[PDB]
Design a protein around this motif. Structure first.
Motif, PDB file in Angstrom:
ATOM      1  N   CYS A   1       0.796  -1.230   0.000  1.00  0.00           N
ATOM      2  CA  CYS A   1       0.000   0.000   0.000  1.00  0.00           C
ATOM      3  C   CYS A   1       0.830   1.283   0.000  1.00  0.00           C
ATOM      4  N   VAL A   2       0.163   2.400  -0.286  1.00  0.00           N
ATOM      5  CA  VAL A   2       0.826   3.696  -0.406  1.00  0.00           C
ATOM      6  C   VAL A   2       1.438   4.178   0.904  1.00  0.00           C
ATOM      7  N   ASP A   3       0.800   3.840   2.019  1.00  0.00           N
ATOM      8  CA  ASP A   3       1.365   4.214   3.304  1.00  0.00           C
ATOM      9  C   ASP A   3       2.600   3.413   3.681  1.00  0.00           C
ATOM     10  N   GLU A   4       2.577   2.102   3.456  1.00  0.00           N
ATOM     11  CA  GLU A   4       3.748   1.314   3.810  1.00  0.00           C
ATOM     12  C   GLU A   4       4.989   1.693   2.997  1.00  0.00           C
ATOM     13  N   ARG A   5       4.793   1.985   1.712  1.00  0.00           N
ATOM     14  CA  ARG A   5       5.884   2.436   0.845  1.00  0.00           C
ATOM     15  C   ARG A   5       6.461   3.783   1.260  1.00  0.00           C
ATOM     16  N   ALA A   6       5.591   4.674   1.727  1.00  0.00           N
ATOM     17  CA  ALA A   6       6.045   5.945   2.271  1.00  0.00           C
ATOM     18  C   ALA A   6       6.827   5.710   3.545  1.00  0.00           C
ATOM     19  N   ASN A   7       6.324   4.826   4.400  1.00  0.00           N
ATOM     20  CA  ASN A   7       7.021   4.554   5.644  1.00  0.00           C
ATOM     21  C   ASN A   7       8.382   3.943   5.357  1.00  0.00           C
ATOM     22  N   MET A   8       8.423   3.012   4.404  1.00  0.00           N
ATOM     23  CA  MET A   8       9.693   2.462   3.951  1.00  0.00           C
ATOM     24  C   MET A   8      10.659   3.514   3.432  1.00  0.00           C
ATOM     25  N   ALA A   9      10.183   4.377   2.536  1.00  0.00           N
ATOM     26  CA  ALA A   9      11.054   5.414   2.001  1.00  0.00           C
ATOM     27  C   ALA A   9      11.573   6.364   3.071  1.00  0.00           C
ATOM     28  N   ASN A  10      10.658   6.914   3.864  1.00  0.00           N
ATOM     29  CA  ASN A  10      11.036   7.868   4.901  1.00  0.00           C
ATOM     30  C   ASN A  10      11.979   7.283   5.948  1.00  0.00           C
ATOM     31  N   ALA A  11      11.746   6.022   6.304  1.00  0.00           N
ATOM     32  CA  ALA A  11      12.555   5.338   7.309  1.00  0.00           C
ATOM     33  C   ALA A  11      13.988   5.170   6.830  1.00  0.00           C
ATOM     34  N   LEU A  12      14.149   5.140   5.513  1.00  0.00           N
ATOM     35  CA  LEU A  12      15.456   4.944   4.913  1.00  0.00           C
ATOM     36  C   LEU A  12      16.220   6.244   4.710  1.00  0.00           C
ATOM     37  N   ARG A  13      15.517   7.373   4.802  1.00  0.00           N
ATOM     38  CA  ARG A  13      16.144   8.682   4.620  1.00  0.00           C
ATOM     39  C   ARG A  13      16.971   8.729   3.344  1.00  0.00           C
ATOM     40  N   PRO A  14      16.362   8.404   2.199  1.00  0.00           N
ATOM     41  CA  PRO A  14      17.229   8.382   1.025  1.00  0.00           C
ATOM     42  C   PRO A  14      17.617   9.771   0.558  1.00  0.00           C
ATOM     43  N   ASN A  15      18.647   9.795  -0.272  1.00  0.00           N
ATOM     44  CA  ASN A  15      19.049  10.981  -0.995  1.00  0.00           C
ATOM     45  C   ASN A  15      18.041  11.244  -2.099  1.00  0.00           C
ATOM     46  N   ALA A  16      17.431  10.177  -2.602  1.00  0.00           N
ATOM     47  CA  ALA A  16      16.462  10.320  -3.676  1.00  0.00           C
ATOM     48  C   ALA A  16      15.469   9.163  -3.685  1.00  0.00           C
ATOM     49  N   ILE A  17      14.233   9.487  -4.049  1.00  0.00           N
ATOM     50  CA  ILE A  17      13.180   8.499  -4.207  1.00  0.00           C
ATOM     51  C   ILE A  17      12.690   8.650  -5.625  1.00  0.00           C
ATOM     52  N   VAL A  18      12.682   7.551  -6.361  1.00  0.00           N
ATOM     53  CA  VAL A  18      12.195   7.585  -7.725  1.00  0.00           C
ATOM     54  C   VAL A  18      11.192   6.462  -7.911  1.00  0.00           C
ATOM     55  N   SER A  19       9.981   6.843  -8.287  1.00  0.00           N
ATOM     56  CA  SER A  19       8.952   5.869  -8.576  1.00  0.00           C
ATOM     57  C   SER A  19       8.824   5.743 -10.079  1.00  0.00           C
ATOM     58  N   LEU A  20       8.635   4.515 -10.540  1.00  0.00           N
ATOM     59  CA  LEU A  20       8.593   4.240 -11.964  1.00  0.00           C
ATOM     60  C   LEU A  20       7.191   3.747 -12.242  1.00  0.00           C
ATOM     61  N   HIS A  21       6.553   4.371 -13.220  1.00  0.00           N
ATOM     62  CA  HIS A  21       5.206   4.018 -13.615  1.00  0.00           C
ATOM     63  C   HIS A  21       5.108   4.039 -15.129  1.00  0.00           C
ATOM     64  N   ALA A  22       3.950   3.621 -15.622  1.00  0.00           N
ATOM     65  CA  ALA A  22       3.575   3.857 -17.005  1.00  0.00           C
ATOM     66  C   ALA A  22       2.084   4.154 -17.057  1.00  0.00           C
ATOM     67  N   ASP A  23       1.721   5.031 -17.987  1.00  0.00           N
ATOM     68  CA  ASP A  23       0.346   5.474 -18.174  1.00  0.00           C
ATOM     69  C   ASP A  23      -0.512   4.570 -19.046  1.00  0.00           C
ATOM     70  N   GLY A  24      -1.810   4.862 -19.041  1.00  0.00           N
ATOM     71  CA  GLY A  24      -2.787   4.137 -19.830  1.00  0.00           C
ATOM     72  C   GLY A  24      -3.867   5.020 -20.431  1.00  0.00           C
ATOM     73  N   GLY A  25      -3.480   6.137 -21.039  1.00  0.00           N
ATOM     74  CA  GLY A  25      -4.465   7.069 -21.561  1.00  0.00           C
ATOM     75  C   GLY A  25      -4.648   6.896 -23.056  1.00  0.00           C
ATOM     76  N   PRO A  26      -5.281   7.882 -23.722  1.00  0.00           N
ATOM     77  CA  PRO A  26      -5.477   7.850 -25.180  1.00  0.00           C
ATOM     78  C   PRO A  26      -4.231   7.371 -25.917  1.00  0.00           C
ATOM     79  N   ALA A  27      -4.396   6.479 -26.889  1.00  0.00           N
ATOM     80  CA  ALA A  27      -3.226   5.839 -27.479  1.00  0.00           C
ATOM     81  C   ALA A  27      -2.310   6.778 -28.268  1.00  0.00           C
ATOM     82  N   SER A  28      -2.826   7.930 -28.687  1.00  0.00           N
ATOM     83  CA  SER A  28      -2.009   8.879 -29.438  1.00  0.00           C
ATOM     84  C   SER A  28      -0.969   9.539 -28.546  1.00  0.00           C
ATOM     85  N   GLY A  29      -1.211   9.479 -27.243  1.00  0.00           N
ATOM     86  CA  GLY A  29      -0.306  10.038 -26.282  1.00  0.00           C
ATOM     87  C   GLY A  29       0.861   9.129 -26.002  1.00  0.00           C
TER      88      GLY A  29
END
Length: 190
Positions: free
Chosen positions: A58-86
């Motif tokens: 869940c979104v809260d556990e991932r935040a707790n994981m990130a914050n607990a680690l005190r990273p220099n950087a957090i990067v989330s990787l996603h991909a979209d699903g909108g109109p195909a021309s995009g």
């Protein structure tokens, strides 16, 4: 940048390509290439998850994981699903900021990442944001971050061109190569 810490979050629970290649698998595999690339630089990494099963944290556990680690950087990787021309990427960041890290460092990270993704040959989204950036207030995951944090939508899974890159091992490495330049670029400023 060796010894610095990066939290990598392969997106899971906020689509799929036409062929049925799932976002969660695309982000996972690309995430692992990014991790390996970062490890090669002596950069320390953590993943938000340890597998690519049908369920993820869940979104809260991932935040707790990130914050607990005190990273220099957090990067989330996603991909979209909108109109195909995009097609193409956009880098999301928290705006308006909810703390000083979000107001500055996270924006710097977003800008540098945008610059490096284009230079590495990933097209900026033609259908969202502006010049590959999108500052927004609606994403809980960015809003809750207390360390530098961006959420990269690498492309639209419904677009034929983005899909071709995503579905290809070689395409995923190209995304990863772009991502590492962006991450490494930001870390160097810190």
């Amino acid at each position: 940048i060796a010894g610095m810490v990066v939290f990598i979050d392969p997106g899971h629970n906020g689509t799929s390509t036409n062929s049925g290649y799932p976002e969660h698998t695309f982000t996972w595999e690309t995430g692992l290439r990014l991790r390996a690339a970062l490890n090669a630089l002596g950069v320390r990494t953590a993943l938000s998850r340890g597998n690519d099963n049908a369920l993820g944290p869940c979104v809260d556990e991932r935040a707790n994981m990130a914050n607990a680690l005190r990273p220099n950087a957090i990067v989330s990787l996603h991909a979209d699903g909108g109109p195909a021309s995009g097609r193409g990427f956009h880098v999301n960041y928290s705006a308006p900021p909810l703390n000083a890290i979000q107001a500055g460092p996270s924006v710097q990270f977003a800008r540098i990442m945008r610059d490096q993704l284009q230079a590495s040959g990933i097209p900026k989204a033609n259908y969202i944001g502006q010049d590959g950036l999108y500052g927004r207030s609606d994403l809980a995951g960015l809003n809750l971050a207390q360390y530098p944090s961006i959420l990269v939508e690498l492309g639209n899974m419904k677009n034929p061109a983005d899909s071709a890159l995503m579905e290809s091992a070689e395409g995923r490495q190209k995304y990863a190569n772009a991502l590492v330049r962006g991450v490494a670029g930001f870390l160097a400023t810190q």
